[PDB]
Amino acid sequence: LKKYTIDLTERAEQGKLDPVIGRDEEIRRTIQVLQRRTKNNPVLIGEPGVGKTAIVEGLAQRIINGEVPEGLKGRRVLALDMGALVAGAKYRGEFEERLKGVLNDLAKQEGNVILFIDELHTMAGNMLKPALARGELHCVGATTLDEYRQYIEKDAALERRFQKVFVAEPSVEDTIAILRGLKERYELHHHVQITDPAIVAAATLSHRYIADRQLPDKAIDLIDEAASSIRMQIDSKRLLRNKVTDAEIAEVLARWTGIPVSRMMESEREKLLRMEQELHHRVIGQNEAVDAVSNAIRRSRAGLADPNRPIGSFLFLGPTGVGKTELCKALANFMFDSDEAMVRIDMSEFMEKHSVSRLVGAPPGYVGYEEGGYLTEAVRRRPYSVILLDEVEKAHPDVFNILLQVLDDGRLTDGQGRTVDFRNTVVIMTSNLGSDLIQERFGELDYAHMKELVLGVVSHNFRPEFINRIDEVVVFHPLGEQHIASIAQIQLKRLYKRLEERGYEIHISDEALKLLSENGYDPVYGARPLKRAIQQQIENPLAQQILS
């Protein structure tokens, strides 16, 4: 170590290495593949920021405190100046230029030295496999799984020395324990006070919304950002608050994910109070009746459903133009937090019995493998989605079991190679076979009497083996005539964007709602030509004088 003597264990005896806790389940491998006779070079494999400092860089802090195995006793973990003394000339060629000046001393150390990571996918490595081929070079490495799998293929100058330490992220609870012995380094630097419910908000609340940093990475900087917002709050040029809270954490978490505090700082039971009120921000209503299917997802938190099944299993029977599109998205707006959780698939594609392998997947060798399926690849894309199966009844009169493995054993296998998991889904089936009769009255006090003629008539294309695996046959509440006047004004919003741009007032007194009461609630045809009760008598002659 003639040029320099950069020592990791000296940084442990001075305390410049950060105080480390936990992570002893995977020091019991790092050492077991380190103090061996052969294969003496561990590589910590995971996501970038999992705890590669938490294992390797605390081992030097573990040497001087004596809880390391014997054989490792009297071993100093060293490092190089790799990052400033890889080079020494002006032009290119400095990838491994002055490596030989500082690798020759390591042979003389006689089984004591351990060289650091130094980002060993960047050492590529013109001199490393010359240096490592004898095995006397005693090291630790660490590289992420994108830079461990893509990096090397069959190097027996590398995999001869490396052991597959696939390091993993801790759970929700574990990273909370890390911040208890890490708040002793933030009581001196930011000069703040950190409390115990303040450190739980960094872990368990960012667990559902934040995934770009692993569990003891995102929970540490979320703590230290509020601790770096303290003197931004105290000393913005009366407001001295060095005691941090969970509100400081939930502040900077709301500014990071994109979603505000409004759907974040509550328990799931606390947004459950206005769940129907956020349902009926866009649902046509009938809140005295249709809260049964509201209770079914409310029954999905305790866990008395089948664990070998998805979250939901239903039937969504009724007319069209009623909530076939409206009710399904609003189930995804609350739990699944999205407007693109929609897998609308009309099952009129089953005019051939060969079309089982098109929504699911062709076999290997047959055409339809390079793109996969429809009810699989979207669920491969979105495993956190509701699933909506439009018009089930047009399945083949001989061929089914397209929807039985998804409900019985919960899982489904496409023709690609990997089984698709449906455990975080809810099935929504619209097999309209006998409920296309909205023209009858049937809806003054009860709305199930429309359904009672269907269960005697729907079962010739259904089977007894299928209706068992769906619990609540939830009938579509109808679209009344007065109920159009709540949900028809959300189409007008582009002209609502237009009317404030021109300084004019064309706001009505009973002149434009009589044609908005002619969309839906149909006796003969439907809402597809009923949408044209507006364009041919208002939009042509009244607002063509607005661009002139």
Q: Which of residues 392-421 bind a copy of itself (CB under 8 A)?
A: 397-398, 401, 413
30 touches, from a copy of itself, ligand ADP, none (C-beta below 5 to 8 Å by class): none
User: Which residues ranging from 300 to 359 are in contact with ligand ADP (CB under 6 A)?
Assistant: 308, 320-321, 324-326
Give the shortest CB-54-to-ligand ADP separation in angstroms: 3
Binding map of ligand ADP across residues 187-216, x = CB under 6 A, - = no contact:
-----------------------------x
Starting at the edge strand found earlier in the chain, the sheet holding 312-317 runs: 345-346, 387-390, 426-429, 312-317, 472-475
Decide: helix, strand or coil at residue 137: coil
User: Could you say whether residue 20 binds ligand ADP (CB under 6 A)?
Assistant: yes
In sequence order, which residues have a C-beta less than 8 Å from that of residue 170 and are 6 or more positions away? 22, 51, 178, 215, 216
Q: Answer yes or no whether residue 535 interacts with a copy of itself by CB under 8 A.
A: yes
Q: How far apart are CA 455 and CA 405, in angstroms?
A: 23
- Letters for 358-387 (x = contact with a copy of itself by CB under 8 A, - = none) are x-x------x--xx----------------
Q: How many residues interact with a copy of itself (rule CB under 8 A)?
A: 122
The span of 165-173, 330-338, 448-456, 487-495 binding a copy of itself (CB under 8 A) equals 487-495
Which partner, a copy of itself, ligand ADP, none, binds residue 59 by CB below 5 to 8 Å per kind? Answer: none
What is the C-alpha separation between 402 and 392, in angstroms, rounded?
10
C-alpha 4/C-alpha 81 separation (Å) is 8
**Minimum Å distance from CB 59 to ligand ADP?**
12
**The only residue of 157, 265, 453, 488 in contact with a copy of itself, by rule CB under 8 A:** 157
Q: What are the φ/ψ torsions at residue 390 (nearest 5 degrees)? A: -75, 125
- Among residues 202, 219, 388, 406, which is the contact residue for ligand ADP, using CB under 6 A? 219
Identify the residue among 40, 41, 175, 385 touching ligand ADP (CB under 6 A): 175
Check if the beta carbon of residue 206 is closer than 8 Å to that of residue 253: yes
Q: In the structure encoding, which two tokens stand for residue 230, read together?
A: 């303290």
Q: Which amino acid would we find at residue 4?
A: Y
> What's at 222, amino acid-wise?
L
For position 54 contacting ligand ADP by CB under 6 A, the verdict is yes
Beta strands in 263-323 (DSSP E): 312-317
Q: How far is the CB of 442 from a copy of itself (least distance, A)?
A: 26
Strands 312-317 and 472-475: parallel
Angle between helices 246-257 and 215-226 (to 10 degrees): 110
Q: Is 518 in the site for ligand ADP (CB under 6 A)?
A: no
Residue nearer to ligand ADP on the CB measure, 132 or 375: 132
Q: Tell which positions 243-272 bind a copy of itself, by CB under 8 A.
A: 268-269, 272
Residue whose C-alpha is closest to residue 294's, from 273, 308, 310, 309: 273
User: Would you report the helix, strand and coil content of the chain in percent, each value rounded to 5?
Assistant: 25, 10, 65
221 scored as a contact of a copy of itself (CB under 8 A):
yes
20 interface partner picked from a copy of itself, ligand ADP, none, CB below 5 to 8 A per type: ligand ADP
Q: C-alpha dihedral over 251, 254, 260, 265, to 10 degrees?
A: -60
Q: How far apart are the first and last CA of the chain?
A: 84
Phi, psi of 353 (to 5 degrees): -80, -10
Nearer to ligand ADP, 324 or 382 (CB): 324
Residues that bind ligand ADP (CB under 6 A): 18, 20-23, 38, 48-54, 142, 156, 160, 170, 175, 178-179, 182, 216-217, 219-220, 308, 320-321, 324-326, 487, 491, 526-528, 531
